[PDB]
């Protein structure tokens, strides 16, 4: 009984960890919709600087 419950807890834990990882990824600011273009030209935008 102890081995069986142990397996169920592990499966739930692995699923829980994977979900947290995905949520963290989806909350990345660069992925989030059309923030109003930045008013300042990004240092990485070489064309606008030129």
């Amino acid at each position: 009984v102890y081995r069986e419950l142990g397996s169920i807890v592990q499966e739930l834990k692995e699923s829980g960890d994977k979900l947290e990882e995905r949520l963290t990824m989806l909350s990345d600011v660069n992925l989030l919709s059309a923030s109003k273009p930045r008013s300042n030209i990004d240092s990485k935008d070489l064309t606008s600087h030129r």
Binding site: V1, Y2, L5, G6, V9
Partner: protein
């Protein structure tokens, strides 16, 4: 000779009775220990799982 042998036979039966008596007293203690071990396993290892 028979009396001696049978005296020795009685000695053997008595020595065995002593061993059995000692053996049965030890078994009684072991059963008590096994009962405590099983209860301790349920309390320490199984009862905490529902919370996890």
């Amino acid at each position: 000779q028979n009396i001696q042998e049978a005296c020795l036979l009685l000695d053997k039966k008595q020595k065995h009775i002593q061993i059995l008596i000692k053996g049965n007293s030890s078994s009684k203690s072991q059963i008590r220990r096994s009962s405590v071990e099983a209860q301790k396993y349920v309390q320490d290892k199984l009862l905490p799982w529902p919370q996890e």
